[PDB]
């Protein structure tokens, strides 16, 4: 027998008409779903490319799930195929993560469809909170690392639209419609704080301040993006408490850029908390 | 060999208490002032590092002036030394470009202090327009290539502040004061459109759309920044027309990223325009 039981799986998606690749390390009935960033590749999830996540969670009593693909998808269900880059199907990542994938993992890998953690970064930080907001039994724990937490507000729909076009030529209009469309507020974590409060979801929200430490990530884009989204994260913390939120961890250290070393540092930092919440 | 060899000059700046390096190619009494970007280095101007600007303007009948230095300076006069990065003097780049350098080049080279062109890109695109707005006799011609043309509006002071801190740890408030200080609107090209109209300045405004061509610059930050400032540039064009502006060239082709190959293409494109306005 091998060492770490890392697997590479093909999970059929009826909604997207294709098999979705999923990296997996079985290690318990509850799992940590590690969502990727905006530039998600079709071969491997960014957590396995850039961090020791599997090694760090090996023997933790938790399974680790790293879905592969979904560049610029926001792990959401889109209204239509991305208009412009020739995408030939409609992304239905929320349907995949909440219905198709958990059903398949339950049947084939013994993973419970309920009582899991959604952990996202950058693009998927907001996705993790939205998944927990609407599917609280599946995700009683959600972590957002350097997420964009008020996507429907001010300049955010415009900036997100630019970033999606930059990463693969995807079109935000095909995803959630123009910014006036209800889908923008439906998928906005700040707007959905009342749901996170009502469900008493355990949330772990992190955002650095743009100053690199010994961990690295010292480049202008990483510094810029972290400083740009920190304000929104602080407003989210404030709004969460004002709205009766009482189950959140907010880490806003005096360091950190929008890069993998810091996201990995937080994944390690939250392990005991996830073990406590999901496994008792 | 009109204006050869290209020369590296040391021009004293009384206002900054130091000598400013200037790359210079002679060739005529009127000159093109080629301003650098946000990451201006202290050894050579970005136009020389990245483009064949001098060779392209050789024998054009125009001298070419490339000031060296001024990282994150916006080619403006700052209120005080940048607070945070140890700067030990106050940038006074508007005084240098409008008084000190032209006096030196007139006395020693015969370059006229009047009737020149200010050409800037990125950070200095707005600087070029502001220099022409306030010093029309010196600059009857100004070009802004992918400039940030409404710096005092909305999220711009915040974004410029982040970018300046990312490029050398410079402080936007040391430059133009708190965002309520008059210096922000004073140095905002959109706000100063009435002066550009009153002076009948010849303006050349370019901005790409974020889509790379075979010219290159195919990276996410270059794509993002270009698509972000395009919106402001389009608003600038509309406001200029609405305010009676009738002496501008607006180039918004369906390609281009925030990178040197496109700025060079525009510099070559505008040569005949500058020659006609300044020499004929």
UniProtKB/Swiss-Prot annotation, chains A, B:
Top EC class, one word: transferase
Section covered of the full-length record: 49 to 328 of 340
Function: The antigen 85 proteins (FbpA, FbpB, FbpC) are responsible for the high affinity of mycobacteria to fibronectin, a large adhesive glycoprotein, which facilitates the attachment of M.tuberculosis to murine alveolar macrophages (AMs). They also help to maintain the integrity of the cell wall by catalyzing the transfer of mycolic acids to cell wall arabinogalactan and through the synthesis of alpha,alpha-trehalose dimycolate (TDM, cord factor).
Enzyme Commission designation: 2.3.1.122, 2.3.1.20
GO CC terms of this entry: extracellular region
Places the protein is found: Secreted
GO MF annotation list: diacylglycerol O-acyltransferase activity; trehalose O-mycolyltransferase activity
Family: Belongs to the mycobacterial A85 antigen family.
Main location per the UniProt record: secreted
Residues involved in substrate binding: 38-39, 122, 150, 228-231, 235, 258-260
Originating species: Mycobacterium tuberculosis (strain CDC 1551 / Oshkosh)
Keywords annotated in UniProt: Acyltransferase, Secreted, Signal, Transferase
Positions of the catalytic residues: 122 (nucleophile), 226, 258
Quaternary context: Homodimer.
Catalytic activity: an acyl-CoA + a 1,2-diacyl-sn-glycerol = a triacyl-sn-glycerol + CoA; 2 alpha,alpha'-trehalose 6-mycolate = alpha,alpha'-trehalose 6,6'-bismycolate + alpha,alpha-trehalose
Gene designation per UniProt: fbpC
Region annotation Fibronectin-binding: where it falls in the sequence: 54-64
Protein name as annotated: Diacylglycerol acyltransferase/mycolyltransferase Ag85C
Coiled coil location: none
